[PDB]
Every structure is written in C-alpha cells, then in structure tokens.
C-alpha cells in the first residue's frame, strides 16, 4: 500500500530527527534544519528565510515544532501539490 | 526524497479517485469506497463507512474534497505518532 | 548510469511507438496523440477531456499546419512543459 | 508509472542540481555546465577548446551563462540528433 | 517465496547473530541484548535508551533469572511485541 | 530497514489474512488454518494429519486457532530451527 | 556483476531461442529470422522485400538460412554501426 | 525491453570506457586491454595469468599488429567468445 | 546473505518440487523429471528433445533402476552438470 | 531466469573463486579451503574439527581438495538438507 507507506514515512522521518537532541519528541532548529535539508530539498528551493520559515511552523510559539505543527506544515506542501491537478 | 515521494502519492492517491465520477475533485461514497479499500487496507458493512463518510465530510456536501481529505490522513498520522511517545 | 541520457531516449522513443501506428510512421495524428497524452502525460491532461480541449491542443502544437505533430513540434511542446516544471523551482 | 513525465522531471532536476552551485542559482556557468556534461551527458562529450566552442554555442544570449532555456534547447538538439536514427537517417 | 517462512527464519538467525559474539554461545548476555535490541529492534526502544530501563527489561525476559537470555526467552519477547501489534487489528 | 520488525509484521499481518476470511475474524477455522498452512508455511506441513495438527494448536479446544495459540505455534518452528544451530 | 558477459550471454541465447523453433534447430529460415528481428532488434528494422534484402544479404554462403556465424556477423556490423556514433564519424 | 538492445549497447559502451582512457582515444592498448578483461571479462582470462599469456592474446587480436586493439578487432575477439558459448548449445557435437 | 548456501536451498527444494506431485512424494517419475528439467534446467536439455533421448537421459539416472530419480541420483546428476561447468575453467583440457 | 542453473553456476564458481589463491589453481589446500568454509557455507562449519574434515573430504589423500571431491561434499550437504523435507 503505497498510501499506507507514505504515511509511514512522514510520521517516521519526524521521530527520525526529533529524537536527536533536546525534547524527543519536538524538533529545535537545528534539527528543523536537517530534515529540511535532508528530506524536502525541493521546498528550499538563507539564515532569515529559515527563521521566517521556523516562525511560521511553531504556531505555539515555543521555539520549536511538534508532530502536530509538522503535519500542519506537511498538510500546507500537500495544499500547493493539489493546485497543479486542479489546472491553475 | 522518500518524503516528497510520500506527498506526492498522498496527493495523487485522491486523484485516482476523485475523476472516477461526478465531480473530478471529490470523492463520492463509491470513489471513497474504493480508495479505502484499496488504498488504506489496514484502516478499514455499510454503516461504518457511512459513519466514516459522514465525519469525513464536515461540509455536508455528501462528498470528500481534498481539503477533507487532508484532515482525515492528518487523523492517522496522529494516531500513528500515538505509538512513538513510547 | 545516466538519467538524463536514458530521459532524453525516453523522450525519443515516446514519439515514434505512437508515431508509427498509422499513417506517416514519423508525425503524430490526432488519434495517435490523443493515445500518447493520455498513456503517457496524464498528469498534463487528466481523464475524459472533451474532445474541444483536445483539438485546441492538437491546433496549438500543430504549428505547420499540416494536421499532424511531427518529431520538430513534438519537442516544443515537451519544452513547454519543462518551461512549467521550471516555474516551480524558480 | 509514466516513463515521459520521469523522464521531463529528470530533464529539469538535473539542471538545477549544477546551476544551484555556484553563482546565479538559475543558470550555468563555465564549470557547472562542465560537470553537467561529464557527470550527466558522458556520450555526447574533450580540450578546454571544444568546450569553450561549445559553451559558446548554447550561450545564444552571449551573457557567458547558460540558462534554463538556451539548455532546453540544448537538448532538443540532441534530440534531434536521436530522431535521425529513427527515419533510417534520411 | 514464502514471507512467513522467511520471516521465522529471520527471527531464528538474527538471536544467534548476536548471541555467539561472547560468552555462552546461545545465550544473550547483556551488552549481546543491547545491540540486538538497538541494531534490530529500534522502534521499541526508541534510540538511545537508558540504562535502567534496559535493565528492568533484561530483567522481564530472563525470567529463569541467569543473567542471560536463552533463546526460549527470546521467543516469548517476539510473541509479546507480536501480540502488541495484533490488538492493532482488533 | 529493519528485518526483523519486517518479520515480526509479516508473522502477524499473515494471521489476520486468513482468520478475516469466515466466521471469527479472528480465529482460524479449520479450512483457514489450511490455506494459512499451505500457502504460507509449505515447508512445515492428509486430513488426519491435519486434524492432529488442529487439535495440538487449539489448546483452549474452541475448535479454533486465536492469535495466541497461533505465536505458541510459530514459536514451536522457531524452536525447531534453533535446534539446527547448536 | 560483469554486464559484458552477460551481454554474450544474450547475444548467444537469443540466436538459440528463435533458431531452434522450426526446421534446423541450428539456424534460422526466414520465419525465425523475422521473429527475432521484430521482437529482439526493433530499434534495426517490415515490409518483405526489405527482409528479403536482410535475408539475402546475412546468408552469405547462400543455404536459404542464417547460421551462427552469419548472425555474428550480422550483430558485429550492428556493433559497427553504433561505433560510428561514438567515433565521432 | 530489449536485452539484445541492451546487448550491443553494453558490447560497444564498454570498448570505449577503456580506449580513450590513454593514447588514441578509439583503440585499446596492452594496459587499457589488460583492464578490460580483467574487470569486465574475468571468467575469459580466469585469475592470477602470466604477462606471456597476455602478450599471446595482445598478439592475437592484433592482426594490423600497430600494437593495438581497434573497435573492429574487438569485435572479431567478442564474436570469437560467442562461437566458443554456441560450441556449448551445439552439444558439442 | 550467501549465495552458496542460498544455491544448496535451491537445488534441494527444487527436487522437492517437482517429485512431490505424482506418486511416490521423494523420488521423480519419468513426467516429473521432464517438468524440472524443462522448466528448471532449459539450457541442459536444450529445446523439444525427442522423447528418445528424455528416455536415455532417465534411463542414465535411475542407476537403481527403479524406474525413479531419488535424490541421490538427483544429486549425482547435478555434481555431473557441475564436472561439465567445471571443465570450462580449467581451460577445457 | 532459472534460480537452479545460476544455483549450479554458483556452486562451481566459488569453488574457482578460492582455489586459484594458491598452489595448484584447481585444488583447494587447507587454508583455502578454511576461507571457503567460513566465507561461503557458515551455517555448516560448528583446528582439530578443520583437520578431520580436511581428511575426510580429501579422498585420494593428496593433501588438498579437488572439485570432485568437492562435489561429494555439497552432495553431502544437499543429502542432510534433503533429511527435513523427508
Ligand atoms: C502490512 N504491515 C505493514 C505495517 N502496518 C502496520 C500498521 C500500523 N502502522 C504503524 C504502526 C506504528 C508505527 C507506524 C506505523 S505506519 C502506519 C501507517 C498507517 C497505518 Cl493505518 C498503520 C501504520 C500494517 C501491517
Ligand atoms: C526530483 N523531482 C521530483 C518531482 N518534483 C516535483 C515538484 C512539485 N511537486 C508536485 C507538483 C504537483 C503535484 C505533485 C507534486 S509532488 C511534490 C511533493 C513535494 C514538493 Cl516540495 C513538490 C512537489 C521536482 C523534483
Ligand atoms: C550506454 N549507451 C547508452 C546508449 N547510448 C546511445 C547513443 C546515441 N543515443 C541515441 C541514439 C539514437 C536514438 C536514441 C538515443 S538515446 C540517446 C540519448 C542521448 C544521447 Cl547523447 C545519445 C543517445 C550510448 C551509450
Ligand atoms: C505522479 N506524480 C509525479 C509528480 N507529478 C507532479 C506534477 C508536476 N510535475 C512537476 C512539477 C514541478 C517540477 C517537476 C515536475 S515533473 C513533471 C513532469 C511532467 C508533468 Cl505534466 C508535471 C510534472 C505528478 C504526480
Ligand atoms: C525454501 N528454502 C527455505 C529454507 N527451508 C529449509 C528448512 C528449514 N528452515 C530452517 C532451518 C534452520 C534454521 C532456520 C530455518 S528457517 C525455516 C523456517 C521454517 C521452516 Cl518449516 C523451516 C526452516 C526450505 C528451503
Ligand atoms: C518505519 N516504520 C516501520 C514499522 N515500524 C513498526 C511500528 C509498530 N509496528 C507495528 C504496528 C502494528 C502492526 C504491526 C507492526 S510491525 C512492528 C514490529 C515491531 C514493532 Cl516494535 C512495531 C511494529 C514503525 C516504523
Ligand atoms: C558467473 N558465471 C557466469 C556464467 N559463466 C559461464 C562460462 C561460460 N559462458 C557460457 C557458456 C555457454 C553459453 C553461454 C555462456 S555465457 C558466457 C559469456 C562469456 C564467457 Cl567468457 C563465458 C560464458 C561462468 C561465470
Ligand atoms: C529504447 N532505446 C534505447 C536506445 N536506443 C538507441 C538506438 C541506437 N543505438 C545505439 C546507437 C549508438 C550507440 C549505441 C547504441 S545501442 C544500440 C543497439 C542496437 C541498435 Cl539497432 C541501436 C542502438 C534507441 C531505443
Ligand atoms: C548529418 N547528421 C545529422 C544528424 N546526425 C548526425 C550525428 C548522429 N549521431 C549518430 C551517429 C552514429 C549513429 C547514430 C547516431 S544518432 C545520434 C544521436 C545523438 C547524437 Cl548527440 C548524435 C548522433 C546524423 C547525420
Ligand atoms: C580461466 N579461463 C581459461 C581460458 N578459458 C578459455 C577456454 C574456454 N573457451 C574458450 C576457448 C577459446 C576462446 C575463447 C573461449 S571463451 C569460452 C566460452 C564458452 C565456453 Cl563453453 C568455452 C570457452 C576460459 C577460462
Ligand atoms: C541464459 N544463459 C545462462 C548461461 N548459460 C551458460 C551455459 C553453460 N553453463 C556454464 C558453463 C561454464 C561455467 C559455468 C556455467 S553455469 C551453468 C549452469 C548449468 C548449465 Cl546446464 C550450464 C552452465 C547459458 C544460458
Ligand atoms: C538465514 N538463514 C538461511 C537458511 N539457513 C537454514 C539452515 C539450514 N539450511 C537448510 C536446512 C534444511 C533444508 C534446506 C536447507 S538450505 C541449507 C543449505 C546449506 C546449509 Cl549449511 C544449511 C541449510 C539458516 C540461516
Ligand atoms: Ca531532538
Ligand atoms: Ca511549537
Ligand atoms: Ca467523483
Ligand atoms: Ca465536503
Ligand atoms: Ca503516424
Ligand atoms: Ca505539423
Ligand atoms: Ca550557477
Ligand atoms: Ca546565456
Ligand atoms: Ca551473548
Ligand atoms: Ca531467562
Ligand atoms: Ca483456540
Ligand atoms: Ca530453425
Ligand atoms: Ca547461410
Ligand atoms: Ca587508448
Ligand atoms: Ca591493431
Ligand atoms: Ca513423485
Ligand atoms: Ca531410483
Ligand atoms: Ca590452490
Ligand atoms: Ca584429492
């Protein structure tokens, strides 16, 4: 089930990352920075952009992102993916 | 990118669906039916897909948009990140 | 060993399996390409468009006129899509 | 799976992933349009003459870069080239 | 190709991978039940355990108490995950 | 990834393929217990034959094979195999 | 592991798979001749008389069949051909 | 879709992956030769062989003999391997 | 993980296969071997042999003449298989 | 494709592979044929229990292991292989 997987890897690359520093379960900046880097080259296309964009994802406003605010975030690439089907 | 990969079949898994019938861009209970079953096996009569289809469809248009849709892999992954807090 | 050398042969060797299959075996006529699009570009089309959307395209690649998309127009119309792609990244 | 719409996908990933090194992130200058070539087109390619006859060809625009566009068609002339096999090289 | 029997297979190997590295050969020692755990189990334990809380599981398995886990022992564990993931079905 | 939780998914996915066929959907009847045993475990394994086997595995003697009594069973193979290394 | 001598292992096989069909299980007639140029070598040729040209020209010690040897031959002109590419002519 | 294809790509790509590594771009010398067999024919030369033995077979696909192998004499070594595995389907008579 | 021990697997099971489904379950029958032979060792027999040489061939195996191939005549013929295979690095002396 | 000639294809192509290392190219000595054990058929091997089974295999007592002899032994091996499925 490619659905079934693909889920799998969102929910796993999170704890991928998350778990390496700090709070487990939450992703700081610097590992913000990896799984960015890493596993979603294509959305980064600087320091001040990443920090706009480190702004926007923790809505909480507690320097950094949990499992929720990152499929909020994940939701929002699925969003701009699904305005090439509709034809633009 | 196993990650972009996995939005990119999210996204496209709606669409294989979704310009079966009617509307291209929602799923009718029948499209929904089929992506279930053979989309999400391990999720899933006729009354708890209805119970499905209706907390799907919080618009009441009696169909899933991908908005809806968005909102109910969102659900799963949820329960999925259940299992990693230990 | 080389993506972009086995997606420019993909991109070749495209045209002439549906090229061949009637007709002038080197240009594409509206039936030839109406199969090409759809088995292999839906993400470009999408299912069931009417046949109106289809003439517009086939008019638009169709640049010589001639009611057919040789190897020449092919290529424009696969640029074009690059261009699209390229918006993206830009 | 759609063996065109990969192969466009490679086409305009791979320029990006030269183009993004150095210098305007958009376009190819000297050295990243060398690595393109000897990583990604090995059968088409070599003296620092050849390539400066070359990166002069497709620079059509004379800006001393190469751009998405002068790539693109770049390709189609290889393309091109490929298509000439098919017609028995008429 | 027969997943399931693959499967027992992959169980059965990968205890004696690990439990002929030191000392009793078919036993699994501490420091042997910590890579296996880490290296082939990681989604129990989640990366980077503590001490502890190896410990009280060290503990859980021998439960014929010898400081060390047979592959008896092991087997029951296996079961024990296995029957974690089956209330998932139900 | 990871074999072994690839295996441990596999012992218990394969479970719930055949005992969601008929009655309980999660007991293995006699002739789920048989197509469970030939397509999956061909190297293991007659009716009489198959009913000493139906009859050691089903230890609660419900006439059924249950999740529990189907690990006791694969754990007994395990346990085979184990024999070979030593 | 070594795609070249998977290659010859190809180019033998194949002559065999189509030769030992009908007749002399050894060559290829024309029958088996057109199977495996359809079906093994597209991207090279339909109409017969430009088979009868082929047939004509690979059968060179004129038995009405392709042997072995005339079908190496045949590959290693193929082979030549693809060589002119990257000798830049 | 067409190991034949596939085949003859492999056959010709691989000459030139070793010939205009040194000298004349087109052609194989002892060294470029040695490297080819070695790494892309092993089962040819088997192991551990002499440079006598290498210098027969150097000598042998020669036949222009300008101490070199050209894409055609390859050829002719290639073929002469392909009759060698035919032998095996023709039982041997 | 190994490929030899994952070859011994293979040339075990694959009797198993096939003498398994007629008759005696452990030793092939005449149509049995014809089976695995056809579909599992196509190289050997080569293509459509008369049913003469089949004969032959089952008459070569069967040294207990019992009418079946057991798996030790089974193992006797592959090791016989392998002596050929063999001789191809040993120069073909 | 057929796994059972690449199978045999292996099997004589290991023996080359360890043989050749060595003296005589075609006959395995003591330590050649010690790699070949420990690299190539683990699940078999358990410098006294070496030596027994170098004098075992090596029939015509030449001191080393030729590919008839070891044949015999992969034969050996397949015949207690064959055990379990009888
Ligand atoms: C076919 N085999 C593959 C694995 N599957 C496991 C089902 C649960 N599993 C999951 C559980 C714990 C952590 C991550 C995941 S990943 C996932 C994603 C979506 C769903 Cl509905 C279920 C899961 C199903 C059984
Ligand atoms: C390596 N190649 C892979 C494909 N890439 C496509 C980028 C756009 N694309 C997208 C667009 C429309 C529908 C589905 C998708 S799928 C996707 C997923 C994630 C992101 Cl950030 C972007 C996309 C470009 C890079
Ligand atoms: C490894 N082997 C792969 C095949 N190669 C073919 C060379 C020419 N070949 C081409 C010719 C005619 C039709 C399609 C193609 S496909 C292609 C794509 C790009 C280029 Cl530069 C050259 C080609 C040569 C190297
Ligand atoms: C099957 N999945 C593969 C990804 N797809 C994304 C659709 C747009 N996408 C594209 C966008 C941006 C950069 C590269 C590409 S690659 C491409 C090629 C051709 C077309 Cl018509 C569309 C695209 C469609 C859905
Ligand atoms: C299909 N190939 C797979 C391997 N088979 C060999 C039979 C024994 N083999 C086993 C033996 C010793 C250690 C681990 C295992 S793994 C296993 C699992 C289940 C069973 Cl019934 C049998 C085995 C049959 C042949
Ligand atoms: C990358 N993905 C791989 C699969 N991972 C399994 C997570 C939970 N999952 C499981 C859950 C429900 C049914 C079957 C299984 S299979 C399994 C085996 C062992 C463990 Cl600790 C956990 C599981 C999660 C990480
Ligand atoms: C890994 N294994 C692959 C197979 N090998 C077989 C050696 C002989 N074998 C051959 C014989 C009969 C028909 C086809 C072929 S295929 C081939 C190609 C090139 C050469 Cl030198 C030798 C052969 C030995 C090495
Ligand atoms: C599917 N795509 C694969 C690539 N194709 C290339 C066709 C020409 N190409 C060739 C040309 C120059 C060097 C090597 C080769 S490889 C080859 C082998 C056989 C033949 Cl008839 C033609 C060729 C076209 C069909
Ligand atoms: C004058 N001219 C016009 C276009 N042609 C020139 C080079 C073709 N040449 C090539 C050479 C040998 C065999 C097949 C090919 S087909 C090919 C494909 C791609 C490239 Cl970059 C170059 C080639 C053929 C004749
Ligand atoms: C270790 N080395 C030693 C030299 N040996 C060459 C003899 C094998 N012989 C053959 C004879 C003459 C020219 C080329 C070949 S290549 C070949 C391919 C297939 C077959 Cl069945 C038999 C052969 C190959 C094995
Ligand atoms: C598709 N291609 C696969 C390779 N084939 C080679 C046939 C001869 N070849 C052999 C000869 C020398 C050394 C190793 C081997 S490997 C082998 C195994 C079984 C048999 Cl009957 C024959 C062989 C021919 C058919
Ligand atoms: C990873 N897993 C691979 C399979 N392993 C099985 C061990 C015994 N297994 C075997 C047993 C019974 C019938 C056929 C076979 S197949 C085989 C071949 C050679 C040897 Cl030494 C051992 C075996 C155990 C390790
Ligand atoms: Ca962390
Ligand atoms: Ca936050
Ligand atoms: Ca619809
Ligand atoms: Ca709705
Ligand atoms: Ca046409
Ligand atoms: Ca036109
Ligand atoms: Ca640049
Ligand atoms: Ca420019
Ligand atoms: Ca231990
Ligand atoms: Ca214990
Ligand atoms: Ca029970
Ligand atoms: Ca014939
Ligand atoms: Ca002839
Ligand atoms: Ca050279
Ligand atoms: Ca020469
Ligand atoms: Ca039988
Ligand atoms: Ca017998
Ligand atoms: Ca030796
Ligand atoms: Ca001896």
Known sequence: C????????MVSTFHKYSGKEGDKFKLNKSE???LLTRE????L???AAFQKL???LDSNRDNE????????FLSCIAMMC????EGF
């Open 2 to 9: 490619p659905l079934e997987k693909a889920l799998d890897v």
């Open 32 to 34: 913000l920075k990896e």
């Open 40 to 43: 979603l080259p294509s959305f």
């Open 45 to 47: 296309g600087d320091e």
């Open 54 to 56: 480190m702004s926007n």
């Open 65 to 72: 992102v949990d499992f929720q605010e990152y499929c909020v």
């Open 82 to 85: 699904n305005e090439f089907f």
